[PDB]
Amino acid sequence: GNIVAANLNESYDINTLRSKSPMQWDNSSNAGFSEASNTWLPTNSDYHTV
Ligand SMILES: *[C@@H]1O[C@H](CO)[C@@H](O[C@@H]2O[C@H](CO)[C@@H](O)[C@H](O)[C@H]2NC(C)=O)[C@H](O)[C@H]1NC(C)=O
């Protein structure tokens, strides 16, 4: 699903940022997309079940 668009300090169209959320692999931190502390966009919060 879409995410609620946070503000980025890079120039992005926030009307379309909802569809560019990171891919949801296994239920780790950042849904297995990264092992960093924070990603460039927030992961959707339903990644434990989806
Ligand atoms: C743009 O990025 C963040 C917000 O997305 C700005 O704020 C910093 O965010 C980091 C992330 O944890 C904090 O640790 C800092 O305390 C924040 N404040 C700072 C660095 O003053 C960040 O400032 C912005 N960067 C720009 C405008 O270059």
Curated annotation (Swiss-Prot):
Disulfide-linked heterodimer composed of the catalytic light subunit SLC7A9 and the heavy subunit SLC3A1. The heterodimer is the minimal functional unit. Assembles in non-covalently linked heterotetramers (dimers of heterodimers) and higher order oligomers; the oligomerization is mediated by SLC3A1 likely to prevent degradation in the endoplasmic reticulum and facilitate heteromer trafficking to the plasma membrane. Disulfide-linked heterodimer composed of the catalytic light subunit SLC7A13 and the heavy subunit SLC3A1. It is found in: Cell membrane; Apical cell membrane. This is Amino acid transporter heavy chain SLC3A1. It is linked to Cystinuria: An autosomal disorder characterized by impaired epithelial cell transport of cystine and dibasic amino acids (lysine, ornithine, and arginine) in the proximal renal tubule and gastrointestinal tract. The impaired renal reabsorption of cystine and its low solubility causes the formation of calculi in the urinary tract, resulting in obstructive uropathy, pyelonephritis, and, rarely, renal failure. Expressed in the brush border membrane in the kidney (at protein level). Predominantly expressed in the kidney, small intestine and pancreas. Weakly expressed in liver. Glycans are attached at residues 9, 27. Acts as a chaperone that facilitates biogenesis and trafficking of functional transporter heteromers to the plasma membrane. Associates with SLC7A9 to form a functional transporter complex that mediates the electrogenic exchange between cationic amino acids and neutral amino acids, with a stoichiometry of 1:1. SLC7A9-SLC3A1 transporter has system b(0,+)-like activity with high affinity for extracellular cationic amino acids and L-cystine and lower affinity for intracellular neutral amino acids.
